[PDB]
Write a protein that binds this ligand. Structure first.
Ligand SMILES: *[C@@H]1O[C@H](CO)[C@@H](O[C@@H]2O[C@H](CO)[C@@H](O[C@@H]3O[C@H](CO[C@H]4O[C@H](CO)[C@@H](O)[C@H](O)[C@@H]4O)[C@@H](O)[C@H](O[C@H]4O[C@H](CO)[C@@H](O)[C@H](O)[C@@H]4O[C@H]4O[C@H](CO)[C@@H](O)[C@H](O)[C@@H]4O)[C@@H]3O)[C@H](O)[C@H]2NC(C)=O)[C@H](O)[C@H]1NC(C)=O
Ligand SMILES: *[C@@H]1O[C@H](CO)[C@@H](O[C@@H]2O[C@H](CO)[C@@H](O)[C@H](O)[C@H]2NC(C)=O)[C@H](O)[C@H]1NC(C)=O
Ligand SMILES: *[C@@H]1O[C@H](CO)[C@@H](O[C@@H]2O[C@H](CO)[C@@H](O)[C@H](O)[C@H]2NC(C)=O)[C@H](O)[C@H]1NC(C)=O
Ligand SMILES: *[C@@H]1O[C@H](CO)[C@@H](O[C@@H]2O[C@H](CO)[C@@H](O)[C@H](O)[C@H]2NC(C)=O)[C@H](O)[C@H]1NC(C)=O
Ligand SMILES: *[C@@H]1O[C@H](CO)[C@@H](O[C@@H]2O[C@H](CO)[C@@H](O)[C@H](O)[C@H]2NC(C)=O)[C@H](O)[C@H]1NC(C)=O
Ligand SMILES: *[C@@H]1O[C@H](CO)[C@@H](O[C@@H]2O[C@H](CO)[C@@H](O)[C@H](O)[C@H]2NC(C)=O)[C@H](O)[C@H]1NC(C)=O
Ligand SMILES: *[C@@H]1O[C@H](CO)[C@@H](O[C@@H]2O[C@H](CO)[C@@H](O)[C@H](O)[C@H]2NC(C)=O)[C@H](O)[C@H]1NC(C)=O
Ligand SMILES: *[C@@H]1O[C@H](CO)[C@@H](O[C@@H]2O[C@H](CO)[C@@H](O)[C@H](O)[C@H]2NC(C)=O)[C@H](O)[C@H]1NC(C)=O
Ligand SMILES: *[C@@H]1O[C@H](CO)[C@@H](O[C@@H]2O[C@H](CO)[C@@H](O)[C@H](O)[C@H]2NC(C)=O)[C@H](O)[C@H]1NC(C)=O
Ligand SMILES: *[C@@H]1O[C@H](CO)[C@@H](O[C@@H]2O[C@H](CO)[C@@H](O)[C@H](O)[C@H]2NC(C)=O)[C@H](O)[C@H]1NC(C)=O
Ligand SMILES: *[C@@H]1O[C@H](CO)[C@@H](O[C@@H]2O[C@H](CO)[C@@H](O)[C@H](O)[C@H]2NC(C)=O)[C@H](O)[C@H]1NC(C)=O
Ligand SMILES: *[C@@H]1O[C@H](CO)[C@@H](O[C@@H]2O[C@H](CO)[C@@H](O)[C@H](O)[C@H]2NC(C)=O)[C@H](O)[C@H]1NC(C)=O
Ligand SMILES: *[C@@H]1O[C@H](CO[C@@H]2O[C@@H](C)[C@@H](O)[C@@H](O)[C@@H]2O)[C@@H](O)[C@H](O)[C@H]1NC(C)=O
Ligand SMILES: *[C@@H]1O[C@H](CO)[C@@H](O)[C@H](O)[C@H]1NC(C)=O
Ligand SMILES: *[C@@H]1O[C@H](CO)[C@@H](O)[C@H](O)[C@H]1NC(C)=O
Ligand SMILES: *[C@@H]1O[C@H](CO)[C@@H](O)[C@H](O)[C@H]1NC(C)=O
Ligand SMILES: *[C@@H]1O[C@H](CO)[C@@H](O)[C@H](O)[C@H]1NC(C)=O
Ligand SMILES: *[C@@H]1O[C@H](CO)[C@@H](O)[C@H](O)[C@H]1NC(C)=O
Ligand SMILES: *[C@@H]1O[C@H](CO)[C@@H](O)[C@H](O)[C@H]1NC(C)=O
Ligand SMILES: *[C@@H]1O[C@H](CO)[C@@H](O)[C@H](O)[C@H]1NC(C)=O
Ligand SMILES: *[C@@H]1O[C@H](CO)[C@@H](O)[C@H](O)[C@H]1NC(C)=O
Ligand SMILES: *[C@@H]1O[C@H](CO)[C@@H](O)[C@H](O)[C@H]1NC(C)=O
Ligand SMILES: *[C@@H]1O[C@H](CO)[C@@H](O)[C@H](O)[C@H]1NC(C)=O
Ligand SMILES: *[C@@H]1O[C@H](CO)[C@@H](O)[C@H](O)[C@H]1NC(C)=O
Ligand SMILES: *[C@@H]1O[C@H](CO)[C@@H](O)[C@H](O)[C@H]1NC(C)=O
Ligand SMILES: *[C@@H]1O[C@H](CO)[C@@H](O)[C@H](O)[C@H]1NC(C)=O
Lengths: 110, 44, 435, 139, 122, 146
């Protein structure tokens, strides 16, 4: 089993400054295809989550430019810039390199 | 070894020495393992 | 009716042969940085005895690691302009480390040619030779070698190595748990590559190795008497903590055009010696597991001696962590007597360090390991022993010899075979048709 | 001073023609697989090793497909027939839809996920046939 | 994430099964004699890999056995080579054990398979 | 005439009766026959330096493999796979040689036929590969007809 840990528990309330968050991997998630497994989601409280990041520094369609996630090897980040709206949600990562599929831990957004 | 050689004849009843005038007795400052030390040798 | 010969091609028959496997790596001039995901096919009903002490993978892996170590010293700096009469004196400033260091000064060559640079550095007494308190010294291997400085950007970290099988050959592997090293198995399986094998270069104690996952395994080779080595597998890993408690300033001196010498500048503060802690309660627990397994192979009283005084590479505990080479004194781990049928405390091991190291039991190719800035601290598991027998009683001493005994302890699971695909058999009334 | 005479079929000249008239030119590509321009009418140069590596590669790839023909029932031939029935989950297309309408390199991009499954079934029915041709010669 | 679907004949696999059931998996091990899982000694490794393969293919061409897995020759089986019955060969014996039974008599049998091809005179 | 190349000199009627002598030295006795190439490999393992005679054994092996496979491929594209005398459906064009059978088979060697027909063999090989390719197409859909 591979464990994913994200350190900040919530988000700062100010819509001016962007505060980047990050996950950490217990094992390197590079798969033998030459591709990684780290994702990033947003579960709005009351609604289903949605995809935001399908690979490290790759952005899903219909997603604003604030959402971008870098990472090299086992270290991983999520760069955040130009906080544009009050789109609340629950942030958590994904280990999809093996089984079982383990997510992050949750991070509230307000 | 490409240096100046201080080279002279050999200091050696008639047939016991014939080819003196082919050999010579050279001597010169050669290097060694230690970089500051110099040494002389006496090769023919 | 008669009975006729046939010829089958593609037959599952292997013989035991020797080849050259190819080095992979978990991702230079000799290995291939592809990172494979190997697979394993569990066979059935086949035995295939191994004889671990006659194994060709150990001779190849000893050859390749020497080839990797020489390859990373070819673009490095030759150090033959630094063989001068040195002018060494005692350091004057926890003050029990000034006896083993000097403060040597020497005329050097510079970036130009017609002028002379006067510089200084702090060497060790193990790296100096008296020539004919201020007196004139000389380095170790001006006499025989051309010393080469190790390049500082190249780390000495053990990076794991897979060995994979070529076309026409295979690699076998005993799946079972309690395997003595030699003799038949019942559970074998074919792999594409080996597991990741870390090149831990160490003497007298196996560091960061694998584990027994059984009781305790010990394996001695079976020449006429076993006066040579014996390898302990050591289930529970005893943990050793090794460190050097002294910061070091590293000054760089330019010897020639485009090449420079990384020397030792100064000691800031204390000069306390380097050492290793060993947990005493876990070590004496560990020797109790070893001594009962040795009784099933000797059945006498079992005492542990120490290696007699001599050279450092054959007596002391040689390892590498942090980029420097610790030579540690293991006399306070190996005296005991076990006459047939919890300790409070820790153990202090004295450790000396050297910089002009001549590795792989070979003359002519010494290496100046550069000094490391900061305060070195390092942790490692003791997962094995290398013991030697001297022969009532029987005494044991710390092992020595080649570094291949580090690879009997890893490659004991594996065996390379060659596949002979032709085979004949009596067939039936199957004769070749006449035309 | 030269001049172009009459012309014949050339290398890859039926690529993108169709599938049924590009199989009338199979020998034209099969002639250019082993010997190239490397063979013409002092040591260890950069261009010397790079020429010698091109000659060892050209034998390894040729023997790869030539091995795979002999494991099947098809050695020394250009069109051979097997006993493996075609499975419509591999491709469902009609007989007049891949012949006379499709070309190769369009059929190549269609079944390239299924060739490893197809290759196993040709080899399996060749073991089963050669044992039966043995066991028919015991009477 | 990678699962594992159906399982077919692996590489050795039938190495421990009997010689009646190991002669249906002959194509699996013939694929691996040349391909492998693979700077002057980089080439000498390859040329030996080619010439170990072509040495066994030319030897099958000397005989009648070119381009087939099971072939048949008209050399009689001399009953002093091994005198075992047909059911205790094809149903009670592996290929690794039969290889040790007739390892003495290998060069004798190959010399007769080659001679009976020169005695075609056709 | 028995012996390697011993029929060089005889007329090509009698030089073609002993073709087994040549197609055994050129199929068996080339790669399968020698085991002493791997007795010189360990002697190259004793010395730690790549010598001049180690390079020339690469170039004499890669010339030996390519010379074997570029005569078996060319016999594989045609219908003449494992045999020594084979017939084709290609009619002999008299503008290649107008010469009679008694002059060819009984007053001309094979080595005098090399120096007459060599400008034409690239044209002749095109017509053997084309007619072999037309044959196997015709015997496939004939096969599928019944
Ligand atoms: C048996 O197995 C154990 C387990 O792996 C092994 O212990 C580990 O050894 C490695 C040796 O590579 C140790 O790695 C070193 O760690 C130190 C300390 O790192 C910690 O602290 C920093 C700062 O607080 C944290 O950021 C970090 O995450 C760790 O928590 C590092 O300082 C070392 O880095 C230097 O060396 C690397 C390799 O050259 C460089 O990539 C790196 O950038 C650093 O070099 C730079 O700085 C130097 C000055 O500090 C300078 O001199 C250089 O020129 C360069 O500019 C290094 O990563 C690891 O910590 C050990 N782990 C434990 C638990 O002990 C044993 O070594 C092994 N034993 C044997 C005998 O094989
Ligand atoms: C080097 O050459 C010098 C002359 O250029 C030699 O000097 C004199 O040589 C004569 C001949 O034997 C001696 O009698 C003198 O005593 C030498 N002079 C001095 C000051 O010693 C010199 O001998 C040569 N070197 C050698 C080793 O022969
Ligand atoms: C070897 O080096 C010594 C260095 O002293 C040379 O000796 C000097 O030579 C010069 C030039 O002839 C003299 O002026 C000095 O008086 C010599 N010094 C002494 C102490 O004798 C010597 O000539 C060199 N030898 C050679 C062969 O070049
Ligand atoms: C290098 O060695 C020389 C002597 O071989 C030292 O020179 C003298 O040493 C005495 C000893 O106390 C001092 O009193 C003098 O002042 C020194 N003279 C000079 C010019 O240095 C010298 O000290 C040594 N160098 C070092 C760095 O120890
Ligand atoms: C470095 O070079 C200097 C200069 O060549 C050496 O200084 C000489 O030391 C001796 C010994 O006392 C004196 O007799 C000389 O007069 C000094 N030379 C000068 C020009 O002052 C020094 O000894 C050398 N040091 C080392 C370690 O090689
Ligand atoms: C080794 O010796 C040298 C020279 O004796 C020491 O360099 C001296 O350092 C002090 C402190 O910075 C200066 O005041 C002196 O001027 C230096 N002397 C020279 C000649 O440069 C050096 O500090 C000594 N190293 C140690 C570790 O004690
Ligand atoms: C060797 O180092 C280990 C750390 O790797 C030490 O283990 C620590 O022991 C203290 C006890 O005072 C605990 O509080 C820590 O939590 C332990 N750390 C870990 C990571 O287990 C061990 O004590 C050291 N042993 C010796 C003899 O120095
Ligand atoms: C380090 O090792 C040395 C030998 O390698 C040990 O030195 C011996 O110590 C005992 C202690 O009583 C003496 O009786 C011996 O005479 C010493 N040996 C020699 C050759 O003189 C030393 O004890 C070890 N260090 C520790 C801390 O045990
Ligand atoms: C074994 O090693 C120890 C130290 O490494 C030697 O010294 C003994 O140390 C213990 C420590 O508790 C003392 O109780 C003993 O009295 C010491 N021995 C003596 C003779 O005083 C010891 O000498 C070594 N040898 C033996 C046989 O124990
Ligand atoms: C083993 O290592 C530890 C730390 O690496 C040393 O522990 C220190 O011991 C001294 C007194 O011996 C204490 O004043 C320190 O507070 C200890 N360190 C810590 C972090 O608590 C220990 O001395 C070493 N064992 C030796 C040298 O035998
Ligand atoms: C390993 O040996 C066992 C021996 O029992 C084989 O199992 C039997 O094989 C025979 C062969 O015809 C069958 O008739 C039996 O029904 C098998 N027994 C069982 C319980 O299934 C087994 O097949 C061998 N392994 C392999 C891979 O063939
Ligand atoms: C079958 O094998 C037997 C082996 O016993 C052959 O008989 C012997 O062959 C050797 C070698 O040629 C001779 O030295 C012996 O004299 C033979 N034995 C006898 C009793 O003559 C036998 O030739 C083989 N072939 C046949 C057809 O039986
Ligand atoms: C190497 O050094 C050995 C040890 O002797 C040391 O070096 C000599 C030159 C003297 O300075 C002596 O006082 C030193 O202790 C020698 O025995 C040996 O001959 C030297 N040479 C070689 C080639 O090994
Ligand atoms: C290990 O077990 C095998 C299996 O019987 C045996 O042949 C061998 O002698 C044993 N080795 C030891 C050291 O007990
Ligand atoms: C070996 O070292 C690793 C890394 O420090 C550690 O996780 C493991 O517990 C150690 N093994 C033992 C037996 O202490
Ligand atoms: C060692 O020297 C450095 C250099 O300034 C200093 O910063 C550090 O405090 C010193 N002591 C240590 C590492 O204990
Ligand atoms: C062998 O070991 C047994 C205990 O397992 C012991 O009683 C016996 O004395 C030992 N043999 C000898 C000769 O001491
Ligand atoms: C190219 O396509 C045209 C019609 O699309 C066809 O008539 C022609 O034969 C094709 N050329 C070749 C060389 O097949
Ligand atoms: C495949 O072809 C058949 C025609 O028989 C058709 O019924 C089916 O829908 C086709 N499947 C796909 C996925 O196009
Ligand atoms: C043949 O395939 C082409 C695809 O390029 C298509 O345009 C054409 O309509 C097809 N022919 C028929 C008769 O459908
Ligand atoms: C087969 O030969 C062996 C040894 O030559 C002999 O022991 C055995 O009895 C023979 N078999 C029969 C059925 O006689
Ligand atoms: C042959 O089969 C019998 C059972 O029918 C078995 O007892 C015997 O061990 C087998 N032969 C060998 C050599 O194993
Ligand atoms: C093969 O011959 C050797 C003598 O060279 C003999 O010892 C051995 O028993 C023979 N093999 C068999 C299976 O009988
Ligand atoms: C060589 O020439 C002579 C003279 O014509 C002839 O009798 C003989 O048969 C020829 N031999 C061969 C091998 O052609
Ligand atoms: C070629 O042979 C024919 C008879 O086969 C003859 O009529 C013709 O003249 C010959 N060609 C020449 C150039 O003589
Ligand atoms: C036929 O053979 C004879 C002798 O072998 C020779 O003189 C004559 O020239 C040959 N005929 C031709 C047309 O060359």
């Amino acid at each position: 089993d591979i464990v994913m840990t994200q350190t900040p528990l919530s988000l700062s309330v100010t819509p001016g400054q962007p505060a980047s968050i990050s996950c950490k991997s217990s094992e390197s998630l590079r798969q033998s295809n030459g591709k990684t497994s780290l994702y990033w989601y947003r579960q709005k409280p009351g609604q289903s989550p949605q995809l935001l990041v399908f690979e490290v520094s790759n952005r899903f369609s219909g997603v604003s430019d604030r959402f971008v996630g870098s990472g090299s090897g086992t270290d991983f980040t999520l760069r955040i810039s130009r906080v544009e709206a009050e789109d609340v949600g629950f942030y958590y990562c994904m280990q999809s390199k093996d089984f079982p599929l383990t997510f992050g831990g949750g991070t509230k957004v307000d | 070894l490409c240096i100046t050689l201080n080279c002279t004849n050999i200091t050696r009843g008639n047939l016991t020495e014939e080819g003196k005038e082919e050999l010579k007795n050279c001597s010169f400052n050669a290097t060694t393992e230690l970089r500051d030390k110099i040494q002389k040798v006496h090769s023919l | 009716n008669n009975l006729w010969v046939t010829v089958y091609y593609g037959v599952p028959v292997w013989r035991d042969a020797e080849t050259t496997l190819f080095c992979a790596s978990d991702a230079t001039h000799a290995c291939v940085p592809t990172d494979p995901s190997p697979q394993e096919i569990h066979l059935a009903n086949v035995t295939e005895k191994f004889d671990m002490w006659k194994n060709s993978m150990v001779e190849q892996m000893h050859t390749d690691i020497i080839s990797l170590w020489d390859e990373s010293l070819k673009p490095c700096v030759k150090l033959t302009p630094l063989c001068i009469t040195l002018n060494c004196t005692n350091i004057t400033r926890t003050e029990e480390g000034k006896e083993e260091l000097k403060n040597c000064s020497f005329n050097a060559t510079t970036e130009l040619r017609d002028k002379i640079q006067k510089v200084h550095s702090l060497f060790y007494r193990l790296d100096l030779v008296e020539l004919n308190n201020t007196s004139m010294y000389r380095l170790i291997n001006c006499n025989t070698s051309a010393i080469t400085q190790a390049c500082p950007k190249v780390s000495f970290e053990p990076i794991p190595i897979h060995y994979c099988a070529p076309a026409g050959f295979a690699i076998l592997k005993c799946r079972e748990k309690e395997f003595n090293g030699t003799g038949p198995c019942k559970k074998v399986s074919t792999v594409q590559c080996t597991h990741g094998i870390k090149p831990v270069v160490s003497t007298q104690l196996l560091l960061n190795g694998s584990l027994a996952e059984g009781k305790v395994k010990i394996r001695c080779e079976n020449i006429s008497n076993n006066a040579k080595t014996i390898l302990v597998q050591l289930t529970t890993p005893v943990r050793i903590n090794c460190t050097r408690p002294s910061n070091n300033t590293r000054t760089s001196i330019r010897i020639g055009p485009g090449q420079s010498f990384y020397a030792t500048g100064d000691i800031i503060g204390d000069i306390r010696k380097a050492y290793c802690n060993v947990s005493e309660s876990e070590w004496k627990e560990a020797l109790g597991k070893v001594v009962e397994q040795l009784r099933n192979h000797f059945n006498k009283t079992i005492t542990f001696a120490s290696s007699s005084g001599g050279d450092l590479e054959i007596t002391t505990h040689s390892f590498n962590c942090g980029g420097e080479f610790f030579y540690c004194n293991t006399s306070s781990l190996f005296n005991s007597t076990w006459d047939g049928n919890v300790p409070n405390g820790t153990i202090t091991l004295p450790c000396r360090i050297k910089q002009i190291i001549n590795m792989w039991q070979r003359t002519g190719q010494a290496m100046y390991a550069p000094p490391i800035p900061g305060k070195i601290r390092c942790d490692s598991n003791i997962t094995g022993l290398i013991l030697i027998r001297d022969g009532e009683s029987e005494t044991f001493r710390p092992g020595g010899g080649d570094m291949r005994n580090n690879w009997r302890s890893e490659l004991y699971k594996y065996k390379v075979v060659k596949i002979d695909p032709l085979g004949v058999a009596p067939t039936g009334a199957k004769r070749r048709v006449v035309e | 001073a030269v001049g172009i005479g009459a012309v014949l079929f050339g290398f890859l000249g039926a690529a993108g023609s169709t599938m049924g008239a590009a199989s009338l030119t199979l020998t034209v590509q099969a002639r250019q697989l082993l010997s190239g321009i490397v063979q013409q009418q002092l040591r260890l140069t950069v261009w010397g090793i790079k020429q010698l590596q091109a000659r060892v590669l050209a034998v390894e790839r040729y023997l790869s497909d030539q091995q795979l023909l002999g494991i099947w029932g098809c050695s020394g031939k250009l069109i051979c027939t097997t006993n493996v029935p075609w499975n419509s989950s591999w491709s469902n297309k009609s007989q007049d839809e891949i012949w006379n309408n499709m070309t190769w390199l369009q059929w190549d991009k269609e079944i390239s996920n299924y060739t490893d499954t197809i290759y196993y079934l040709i080899e399996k029915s060749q073991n089963q046939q050669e044992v039966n041709e043995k066991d028919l010669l015991a009477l």
